[PDB]
Amino acid sequence: GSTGLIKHTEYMEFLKSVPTFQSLPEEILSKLADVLEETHYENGEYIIRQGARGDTFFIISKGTVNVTREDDPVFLRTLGKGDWFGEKALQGEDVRTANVIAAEAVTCLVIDRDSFKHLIGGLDDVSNKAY
Numbered sequence: 001g002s003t004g005l006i007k008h009t010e011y012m013e014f015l016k017s018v019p020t021f022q023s024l025p026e027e028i029l030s031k032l033a034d035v036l037e038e039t040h041y042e043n044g045e046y047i048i049r050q051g052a053r054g055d056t057f058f059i060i061s062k063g064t065v066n067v068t069r070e071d072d073p074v075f076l077r078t079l080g081k082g083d084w085f086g087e088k089a090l091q092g093e094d095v096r097t098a099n100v101i102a103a104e105a106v107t108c109l110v111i112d113r114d115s116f117k118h119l120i121g122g123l124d125d126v127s128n129k130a131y
């Protein structure tokens, strides 16, 4: 079978559609596409819980998510395809600072901390973004 190879190309083309990841050398995009895990959620499932230890980074390939924080939660924003989240816990303190909740059928491409630090950790787009 060639499914993994086809999927690998699909992941690389998807990463290239996201401005954050365009600066990355082809070899890094290829390794990122190797190590990410495609993960599926349905409406209402918490992808990230505020207060938890965090060790994963997420890129949305399908659907939308809601980002909330505890106050009756405070609604912060909604993200969709090509957006990413979960970087704050991967620098300095490792605590998740908000909830991220699937708002419909969602697919995320997920990478662990070590892969993140090795392949992405130092994009100013990721680590020194203001919001």
Ligand SMILES: Nc1nc(=O)c2nc(Sc3ccc(Cl)cc3)n([C@@H]3O[C@@H]4COP(=O)(O)O[C@H]4[C@H]3O)c2[nH]1
Residues within 6 Å of the ligand: 048, 054, 067, 076, 077, 079, 084, 085, 086, 087, 088, 089, 090, 095, 096, 097, 098, 099, 100, 129, 130, 131
């Ligand atoms: N505290 C907090 N307040 C927000 O207003 C907010 N908005 C988002 S989405 C977003 C992601 C990237 C950019 Cl450039 C812009 C918006 N997030 C994300 O939720 C995650 C929970 O897990 P974490 O590890 O604390 O990282 C966190 C962030 O990625 C926010 N977190």
Ligand code: NA
Residues within 6 Å of the ligand: 088, 089, 090, 091, 092, 093, 094, 095
């Ligand atoms: Na942190």
